[PDB]
Design a protein around this ligand. Structure first.
Ligand SMILES: [Mg+2]
Ligand SMILES: [Mg+2]
Ligand SMILES: [Mg+2]
Ligand SMILES: [Mg+2]
Ligand SMILES: [Mg+2]
Lengths: 244, 250, 243, 111, 244, 242, 233, 205, 241
């Protein structure tokens, strides 16, 4: 018979959770966002589509901070992402309240993971329609992670999700092969901007806005800050430069 | 989120059949054979240890369980369902009886308590029935020895001897011929071994069989001396060697 | 009526298809693992496959340190695996607080199996698609391997294997134990048991391994730990002399 | 033991004329023999041409005034900007006060 | 969602009938017949056992006749386990009334309460009804010997003679034939047994296939005596009447 | 099956639209707003001649200054009237004044979409929308005489005249043409009577129709049969002219 | 195909769509048009009100949430009442607890999260109304567009409802011009009316038809209805 | 302190030094003037290298320590080894949040490789104070002067053991609620060392 | 926890569960009530599907809600009990708080209200019962008779009937009951009632039960014999012609 894909927690005859798989489709129809881990931090960047000239420039911020050291960006259904970040924040606070130290990145990742996975356990809830790239700096280094609708997550050297995910991952694999030493946050910011611009070709019909942020032990103090001003324009230029 | 399944999963079909209960009974039919025989001075419950691999350590999986020092149980059906039914039965023996009356419950009543747990799985919201049938054997001061069978519906009945599972029809037949009301426990253990041999496909020995009796009080299994009113548990699982010794007198 | 294949209710044959489908999900990762017991240790070996060159190899594991003494290897999707690891860690800690002693591997297995049985009976809960192999060197029982599955079944093993190629590994181990006649590898050092393990996995799967292709956990009295790439290599370099 | 109340002093006075009304109150706030402030307003314009003062334990006074000004805000919301008349404001305040009948606002209010 | 799996046990059919109740009554019609006959000096309850064998312990058995009080008893037709659930709540209600009023509970009060519980499962809750029909035989100072009956719907009625379970139409016809308002218990016993004998679906009516009870006010005493016949006593009374 | 708070592919809530259909099967009710009062008239429609018509309550007082007429599954309105009355009295208690008619209306309409099966948002227990529409008419100092039509969808509109019920499409058409900013109470009563007379299956008499009005001076009053018979008579004559 | 995947919001389609949400977005499309636009000093909402017959009132589209913020609705009015109430409460809490005026960006964030909860749980139903939120906070003038899917966007101008696309184009053209109408409230409004009058078709905007709202520098959110919109036709 | 319950009285202190930190305490518990246990162990392990000295109510401190031990075991299983600051925070949370029903003055001392030795004192109110060394217990009043005069930062193990030994003997000398043996627990990179000093030694110093 | 919307609107504006509840009423024994000038009589037919009943005990079809108000019904017997019990409790609760027994309209509005609640509350199905409630308000002498139905709709009747074949007997009352001379006597009121039931029951004495309710808590159930005397006298004003 059929019908194994109408209710969330149901296992199909081949062991798949179809509802989680359709959620992934909502993520693939979304904007591309990436994360690049560097020698002492992480950089996140995302493509923001300009639906029209009426959108106020630089105001519809998509990258989010959790606590003061974690950055989160996601692709898919934006509201679902906000929902996940709100939980992330409650979880980070709980951790700091009881243990005093800000939440380690590996701990935080699992917190997000268990919550997302929880949404694949019952038919009364819908899985998250987003893949989230996040990370920051903690007691022992930088960490970058990517979380899928199934609740699956792993650590990354670079990560990409969204429509242009393939070009991005392609460009990301180039960086990891040429620079095994690591990448300075400065270069990673530039490279992230590049990767997004290049990835932007997978959606070349609308104009776009670049958003970058980073958390670096030397450039931001292990705190999350958005890339604004001089720093941002330098990366935009470097991007429109290596395109042709 | 939340268990919104507050409705019955077992409902009456147009023919008056309780679907899930009939299907649970079918699950019980495909299970290994277990039997119980009641003698004048004891009861024996037995089953085969269908080890699902030779790398598994068959001793770490007890199919014959002690519920109270004078009551034991065996089953045929879904093992995990039985395991949780045993935990619940050992507990209720305490909560609804020992903590109130200072003594362990009589067989029929403990039986009645397990049965209620099974019936509710047949009507409460959002659950399926238990896929097991149990044979509970025990003793108590005022009723003596007894053997009861409890089905997925929650119905229970007392037996002189019976068998459940795979070859229960053939076994119930072997038991009807061999059973009489003058049997000593050793004779029932014997007949139990014979009945089981026919249901058992392969190797028949003390490491592939599980037998337990409810008989005389075993002071050597009490663990302490000094109090004379409590004389020891009547439940005793036969060891691998005790079974073999009896298999040779076939 | 026909929805009997979507929730945990009996099919007309007395089967629970959702449980059966949960057993197929355990094989979705294409990772095999095996566990053997030494004279005073227990080792679990599990394959490690890192496809994407963008992943941080140090975070890809299906072996979890449940408590100071219990280790657990999961064969199944990572999200369900981690859901189980978290619960097991909580159960183990709570047991120690309440009862004053460390939770035995076998008792942890029984508990996790009982929770699984529940998902099998209650329609709102879906089974987790994972098989859990718990190992330790119990203070009363000695080296131990208890494995639980989606049906809520669990039992203890002399050794065991799990994954898509379970049968090849199992027949291999089975043959070794029929040949030696004992229920454990007769070596004193956990290092040799680890070697025995890796050797038999190679002999069984017909595959050669490097240091980044294996994942190893060892249980000894009072501790369970995972081997580093470098410790594994030393194991690999020691085996390339019998073969 | 913790005493939830205090006495911040002060005196207020309301006089109704034919076509006007005044509500005056001194400006000193005290605790026992000390002056907390020489200028701490105790009479407020609540909107809708209503002045109010809740004199006694100042924390309770601040709270009631805060709640009443809010009541006026919601009255407009819930009743198409209708003006809250003094007799209505009065009945409303009776309800605010009696709401804490068993843990009173230790104030004497005048509007 | 979960609506998908709900059988809706408490809805009306287009004809105003309760599906589940109608189906429960069908289940009941397959159970061994239980007969109750009311005399001027006692009541008789007789019942035919379902699913037996040579090996079943008839001595230590009770699957059809249960004592609810020293003055009230029921005969059960349907699922034994469902019956035990209800029987126990009835036993408690009887004791609650005794505690409250220091008088034994009048029969109809007990009957009404039980029926009301059955009715509840009929109008709210979403649970299947109890597949049981009861014949209540009891005595009290207001109405003397009484006999009532309740079914899955929760409707109850009173009778001079009644049967529940299999072959009711046939049994009721035979009862309505040989029953006389001035009957004596000894005479009621015979009729109950005669009736079962002619409606049994099995070979011959033998003792091992019966449960029998009478509630009599033995003139040489005062308290009403409920007697649950023992195997040998059923064999004895079966001969005197003439079924051998 | 399909949920109770599900949207249709057109963006309409299924249960609310269907609710609206049950309302089209109810007795007609008409309300007309003038500058001397608001008239509310309703068709009684007894299902048989043995029914004592005076026990048919389709026009009810909410407060001295607010009355209302109903059409649809009339039993559904009982809880609605209870709420409206309690809201008005409660408002008087809290504020020592009369509740505005819009406010009373809005309060009633807040109940409307409070139906569903655990609809994530708040706690709305009512398995289905209401199957009755209401015409609420009254007077307050700020906006004078008002007539409102409250639907199960939660939306309510202010109307100079409005008909609801089975003969509504026809009746509303007449109202559209006969209403003008200068009608008198007496003229209004007559119109309501006339239009009810037109759409009704049975012949209108004082026993199968009911009139009422609400005025600033006397408040809400249900016209007793005698007052209406005279008005009906006064109609037979005014129509029998040209 | 559809009745399989559109019965609850808790069900994703095979292409990753949320049909109940998309159907909600449709109710908005059958609602009357409303425009929002802002300069660097004021933000205006202009809304075409709709009636049922020619004997009824015209349903209000603008709701004041606090002295510095308000919105215009399109779609299911009961829902706008539910969401503007929340906004009123959130605005109130900010003032009461922090003595702070709620930022529009925050109001938007709050609205998005409230809408989302109704799209991930079973039994619920998405909100079926769209809102244009204008306000004047510490960072100036703001206009936000809220859609039931939970997507809230900050804009210079916009419009929602049936035929909204017309005014949306006028604004998209007139941007360079209206973004500079500083210190002149009446002009901004006029631009808003010009904008809204590009989505007309049925009739011409009359005195019973138009609704305008403005907020800004020294202007508390104020609603002009009927009588006072005469000077703008 | 509840009427009649066992009191720890005590003379407890924790002192950080070059190699790490040392905890010390007496071993007397009392119910009035009766010594309920003359050889108690007030040095409690909540983690391998995180210990605490208990004072106040015996029941309360055991209950609290039992819960901190649990929270830290679970922390460890999930996030690795906890810092002393984290252990102090868990202790604080329990002491502060239940201040109305508990009488517990707890000193938390621990060793880490990044932070070396650390001491946190959690007094009756539930406040936490990180210090070079801390003294508590009823016998502590008597050694405030002695301790402030003789403590120096970066002392050696030998010197620290001596300082703790002299301080507590004085504390034990004057306080009736302190007595028995002097127990110490040395926490360093090398491990955990348990020391015990009998009356005959400390009494005449 | 169970709160599934069982009564909901279908495409055409009907609530099936309520409509199906009515069908249950259509299958129940007929009940009729007609009022005189100083009395109300309630007649009911006895379910004849099975016979050998103990008339002494069996739940009567007409039930006293209080000393002055009675309720009869047609529909699910079990459901009637729930309504009757709620009514009896509310009757005592009214005496306790208002210091005066319930009027008949009040009691009716209460029962009807309960019926309606079960039509728009989650997890419950409507009552498959319609009732006839009759009696006299305290200190008043005008007879009262009301009828309630599953939807929760209620109203008063000079005479009314519900249950199987009610359509038929309703037709008998519509052209045999005149409000100008309502049965001016207990005797003639009873006769009219029996007459109406005879047009359906099909020649059966014990088949009809009549209950007569007069002012000031005087309620009596006529005996099998008292009624037979009526059927006889009735077969005369039919056979003489
Ligand atoms: Mg991927
Ligand atoms: Mg399940
Ligand atoms: Mg489910
Ligand atoms: Mg006023
Ligand atoms: Mg001392």
């Amino acid at each position: 018979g059929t019908g194994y894909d109408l209710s969330n927690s149901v296992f199909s005859p081949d062991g798949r959770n179809f509802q989680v798989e359709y959620a992934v489709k909502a993520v693939e129809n979304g904007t591309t966002s990436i994360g690049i881990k560097c020698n002492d931090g992480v950089v996140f960047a995302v493509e923001k589509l300009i639906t029209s000239k009426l959108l106020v420039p630089q105001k519809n911020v998509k990258i989010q901070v959790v606590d003061r050291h974690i950055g989160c960006v996601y692709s898919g259904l934006i509201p679902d992402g906000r929902h996940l970040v709100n939980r992330g924040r409650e979880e980070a606070a709980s951790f700091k309240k009881l243990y005093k130290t800000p939440i380690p990145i590996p701990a935080f990742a699992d917190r997000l993971g268990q919550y997302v996975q929880a949404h694949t356990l019952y038919n009364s809830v819908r899985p998250f329609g987003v893949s989230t790239i996040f990370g920051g700096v903690d007691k022992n280094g930088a960490h970058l992670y990517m979380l899928e609708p199934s609740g699956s997550y792993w650590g990354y050297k670079g990560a990409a999700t969204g429509k242009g995910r393939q070009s991005a991952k392609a460009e990301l694999e180039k960086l990891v092969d040429h620079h095994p030493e690591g990448l300075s946050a400065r270069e990673a910011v530039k490279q992230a901007a590049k990767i997004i611009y290049l990835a932007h070709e997978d959606n070349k019909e609308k104009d776009f806005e670049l958003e970058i942020s980073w958390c670096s032990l030397s450039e931001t103090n292990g705190l999350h800050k958005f890339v604004k001003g001089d720093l941002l324009q330098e990366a935009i230029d470097f991007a429109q430069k290596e395109i042709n | 989120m939340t268990d919104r399944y507050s409705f019955s999963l077992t409902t009456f079909s147009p023919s008056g059949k309780l679907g899930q209960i009939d299907y649970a009974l079918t699950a019980v039919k495909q299970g290994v054979t277990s039997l119980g025989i009641k003698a004048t001075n004891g009861v024996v419950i037995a089953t085969e240890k269908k080890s699902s691999s030779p790398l598994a350590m068959s001793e770490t999986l007890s199919k014959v369980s002690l519920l109270t020092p004078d009551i034991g149980a065996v089953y045929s059906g879904m093992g995990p369902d039985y395991r949780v039914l045993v935990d619940k039965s050992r507990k209720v023996a305490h909560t609804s009886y020992k903590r109130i009356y200072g003594e362990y419950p009589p067989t029929k009543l403990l039986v009645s308590e397990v049965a209620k747990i099974m019936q509710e799985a047949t009507q409460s919201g959002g659950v399926r029935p238990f896929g097991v049938s149990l044979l509970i054997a025990g003793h108590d001061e005022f009723n003596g020895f007894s053997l009861y069978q409890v089905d997925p519906s929650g119905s229970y009945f007392p037996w002189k001897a019976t068998a459940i599972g795979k070859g229960s029809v053939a076994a119930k037949t072997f038991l009807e011929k061999r059973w009489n009301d003058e049997l000593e426990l050793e004779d029932a253990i014997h007949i139990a071994l014979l009945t089981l041999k026919e249901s058992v496909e392969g190797e028949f020995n003390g490491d592939t069989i599980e037998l337990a009796i409810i008989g005389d009080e075993n002071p050597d299994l009490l663990g302490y001396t000094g109090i004379p009113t409590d004389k020891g548990p009547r439940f005793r699982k036969l060891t691998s060697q005790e079974i073999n010794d009896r298999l040779e007198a076939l | 009526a026909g929805y009997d294949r979507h929730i945990t209710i009996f099919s007309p044959e007395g089967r629970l298809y959702q449980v059966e489908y949960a057993f197929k999900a355990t094989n979705q990762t294409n990772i095999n693992s095996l566990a053997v017991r030494g004279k005073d240790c227990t080792v679990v070996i599990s394959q490690k496959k890192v496809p994407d060159k963008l992943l941080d190899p140090t975070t890809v594991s299906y072996i979890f340190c449940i408590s100071r003494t219990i280790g657990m290897v999961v064969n199944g999707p990572i999200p369900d695996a981690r859901n189980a690891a978290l619960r097991a860690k909580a159960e183990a800690a709570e047991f120690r607080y309440k009862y004053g002693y460390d939770m035995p591997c076998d008792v942890l297995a029984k508990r996790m199996a009982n929770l699984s049985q529940i998902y099998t009976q209650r329609a709102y809960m879906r089974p987790l698609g994972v098989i859990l192999t718990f190992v330790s060197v119990d203070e009363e029982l000695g080296p131990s391997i208890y494995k639980t599955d989606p049906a809520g079944y669990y039992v203890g093993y002399k050794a065991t294997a799990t994954g898509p190629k379970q049968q090849e590994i199992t027949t291999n181990l089975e043959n070794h134990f029929k040949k030696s006649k004992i229920d454990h590898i007769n070596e004193e050092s956990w290092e040799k048991v680890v070697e025995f393990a890796i050797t038999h996995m190679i002999d069984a799967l017909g595959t050669e391994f490097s240091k980044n292709d294996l994942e190893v956990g060892v249980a000894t009295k009072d501790k369970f730990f995972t081997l580093s790439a470098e410790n594994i290599e030393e194991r690999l370099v020691a085996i390339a002399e019998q073969d | 033991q913790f005493n939830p109340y205090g006495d911040n002093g002060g005196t207020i006075l309301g006089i109704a004329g034919e076509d006007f009304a005044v509500l005056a109150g001194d400006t000193r706030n005290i605790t026992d023999y000390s002056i907390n402030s020489r200028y701490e307003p105790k009479v407020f314009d609540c909107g809708d041409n209503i002045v109010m003062s809740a004199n006694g334990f100042a924390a309770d006074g601040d709270a009631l005034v805060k709640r009443f000004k809010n009541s006026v805000k919601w009255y407009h919301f819930d009743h198409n900007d209708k003006k809250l008349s003094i007799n209505s404001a009065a009945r409303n305040i009776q309800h605010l006060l009696y709401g804490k009948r068993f843990f009173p606002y230790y104030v004497h209010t005048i509007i | 969602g979960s609506r998908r799996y709900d059988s809706r046990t408490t809805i009306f059919s287009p004809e105003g009938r309760l599906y589940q109740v109608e189906y429960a009554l069908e289940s009941i019609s397959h159970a061994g017949t239980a007969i109750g006959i009311m005399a001027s000096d006692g009541i008789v309850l007789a019942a035919e056992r379902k699913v037996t064998s040579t090996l079943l312990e008839q001595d230590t058995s009770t699957e059809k006749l249960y004592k609810l009080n020293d003055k009230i008893a029921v005969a059960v037709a349907g699922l034994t386990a469902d019956a035990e659930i209800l029987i126990n709540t009835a036993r408690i209600h009887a004791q609650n009334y005794l505690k409250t009023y220091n008088e034994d509970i009048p029969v109809e009060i007990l009957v009404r309460r039980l029926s009301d519980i059955k009715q509840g499962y009929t109008q709210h809750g979403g649970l299947r009804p109890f597949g049981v029909s009861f014949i209540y035989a009891g005595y009290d100072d207001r109405y003397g010997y009484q006999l009532y009956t309740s079914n899955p719907s929760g409707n109850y009625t009173g009778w001079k003679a009644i049967s529940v379970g299999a072959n009711t139409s046939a049994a009721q016809t035979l009862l309505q034939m040989d029953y006389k308002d001035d009957m004596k218990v000894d005479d009621a016993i015979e009729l109950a047994l005669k009736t079962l004998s002619k409606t049994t679906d099995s070979s011959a009516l033998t003792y091992d296939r019966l449960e029998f009870a009478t509630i009599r006010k033995g003139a040489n005493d005062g308290e009403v005596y409920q007697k649950i016949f023992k195997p040998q006593e059923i064999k004895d009374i079966l001969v005197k009447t003439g079924i051998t | 099956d399909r949920g109770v708070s599900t949207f249709s592919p057109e963006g309409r809530l299924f249960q609310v639209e269907y609710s609206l259909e049950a309302i089209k099967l109810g007795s007609t009710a008409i309300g007309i707003a003038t500058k001397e009062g608001v008239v509310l008239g309703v068709e009684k429609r007894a299902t048989s001649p043995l029914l004592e018509s005076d026990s048919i309550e389709k026009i009810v007082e909410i407060d001295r200054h607010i009355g209302c007429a109903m059409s649809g599954l009339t039993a559904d309105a009982r809880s609605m009237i209870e709420h409206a009355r309690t809201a008005a009295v409660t408002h008087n208690l809290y504020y020592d004044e009369d509740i505005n008619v819009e406010s009373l209306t809005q309060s009633v309409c807040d109940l409307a979409l409070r139906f569903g099966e655990g609809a994530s948002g708040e706690e709305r227990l009512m398995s289905r929308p209401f199957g009755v529409a209401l015409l609420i008419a009254g007077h307050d100092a700020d906006d004078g005489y008002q007539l409102f039509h409250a639907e199960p969808s939660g939306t309510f509109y202010r109307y100079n005249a409005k008909a609801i019920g089975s003969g509504s499409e026809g009746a509303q058409a007449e109202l559209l043409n006969e209403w003008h900013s200068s009608l008198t109470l007496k003229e209004a009563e007559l119109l309501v009577l006339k239009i009810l007379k037109q759409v009704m299956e049975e012949k209108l008499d004082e026993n199968n129709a009911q009139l009422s009005c609400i005025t600033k001076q006397d408040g809400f009053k249900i016209y007793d049969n005698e007052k209406t018979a005279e008005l009906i008579k006064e109609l037979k004559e005014k129509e029998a002219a040209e | 195909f559809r009745n399989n995947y559109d019965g609850d919001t808790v069900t994703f389609s095979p292409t990753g769509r949320l049909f109940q949400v998309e159907y909600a977005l449709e109710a908005i499309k059958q609602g009357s048009v409303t425009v929002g636009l802002r300069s660097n000093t004021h933000a205006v909402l202009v809304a075409l009100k709709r009636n049922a017959d020619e004997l009824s009132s015209y349903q209000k589209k603008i709701i004041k949430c606090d002295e510095h913020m308000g919105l215009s609705l399109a779609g299911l009015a009961p829902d706008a009442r539910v969401l503007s109430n929340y906004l009123r409460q959130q605005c109130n809490y900010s003032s009461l607890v922090f003595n702070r005026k709620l930022a529009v960006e925050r109001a938007g964030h709050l609205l998005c999260d409230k809408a989302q909860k109704n799209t991930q749980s079973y039994g619920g139903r998405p909100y079926g109304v769209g809102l244009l939120i204008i306000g004047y906070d510490k960072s100036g003038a703001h206009l936000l567009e809220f859609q039931p899917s939970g997507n809230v966007t900050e804009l210079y101008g916009t419009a929602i409802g049936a035929r909204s696309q017309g005014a949306k184009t006028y604004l998209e053209r007139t941007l360079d011009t209206f973004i500079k109408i500083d210190g002149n409230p009446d002009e901004l409004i006029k631009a808003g009316v010009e904008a809204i009058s590009q989505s007309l078709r049925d009739e011409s905007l009359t005195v019973d038809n138009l609704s305008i709202a403005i907020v800004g520098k020294d202007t508390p959110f104020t609603i002009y209805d009927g009588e006072a919109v005469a000077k703008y036709i | 302190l509840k009427k009649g319950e066992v009191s720890l009285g005590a003379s407890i202190m924790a002192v950080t030094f070059k190699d790490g930190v040392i905890l010390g305490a007496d071993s007397r518990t009392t119910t009035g003037a009766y010594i309920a246990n003359r050889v108690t162990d007030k040095l409690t392990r909540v983690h391998d290298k995180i210990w605490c000295c208990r004072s106040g109510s015996a029941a309360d401190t055991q209950a609290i320590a039992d819960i901190v031990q649990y929270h830290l075991e679970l922390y460890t299983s999930q996030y690795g080894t906890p810092s002393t600051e984290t252990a102090a925070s868990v202790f604080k949370e329990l002491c502060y949040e239940n201040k109305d029903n508990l009488t517990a003055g707890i000193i938390v001392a621990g060793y880490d490789d990044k932070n070396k030795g650390e001491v946190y004192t959690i007094p009756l109110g539930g406040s936490v104070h990180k210090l070079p060394y801390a003294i508590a217990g009823s016998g502590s009043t008597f050694i405030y002067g002695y301790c402030d005069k003789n403590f120096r930062e970066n002392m050696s193990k030998e010197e620290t053991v001596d300082f703790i030994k002299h301080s507590l003997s004085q504390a034990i000398k004057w306080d009736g609620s302190s007595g028995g043996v002097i127990r110490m627990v040395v926490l360093t990179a090398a491990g955990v060392e348990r020391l015990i000093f009998y009356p005959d030694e400390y009494e005449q110093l | 926890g169970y709160d599934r919307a069982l009564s909901i609107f279908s495409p055409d504006g009907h609530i099936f569960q309520v409509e199906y509840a009515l069908e249950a009423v259509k299958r129940g024994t007929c009940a009729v009530g007609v009022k005189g000038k100083n009395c109300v009589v309630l007649g009911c037919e006895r379910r004849s599907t099975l016979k050998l009943q103990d008339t002494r005990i069996t739940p009567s079809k007409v039930s006293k809600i209080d000393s002055h108000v009675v309720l009869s019904f047609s529909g699910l017997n079990a459901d009637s009990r729930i309504l009757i019990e709620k009514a009896r409790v509310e009757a005592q609760s009214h005496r306790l708080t208002l210091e005066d027994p319930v009027t008949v309209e009040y009691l009716t509005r209460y029962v009807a209200g309960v019926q309606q609640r079960y039509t728009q509350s989650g997890g419950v199905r409507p009552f498959g019962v319609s009732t006839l409630i009759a009696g006299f308000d305290p200190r008043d002498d005008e007879p009262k008779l009301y009828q309630t139905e599953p939807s929760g709709i209620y109203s008063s009747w000079s005479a009314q009937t519900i249950g199987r074949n009610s359509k038929t007997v309703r037709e008998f009352l519509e052209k045999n009951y005149d409000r100008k001379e309502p049965p001016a006597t207990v005797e003639e009121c009873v006769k009219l009632t029996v007459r109406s039931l005879l047009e359906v029951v099909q020649t059966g004495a014990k088949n009809i039960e009549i209950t007569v309710v007069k002012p000031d808590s005087d309620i009596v159930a006529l005996s099998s014999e008292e009624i037979n005397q009526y059927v006889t006298q009735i077969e005369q004003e039919k056979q003489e012609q």
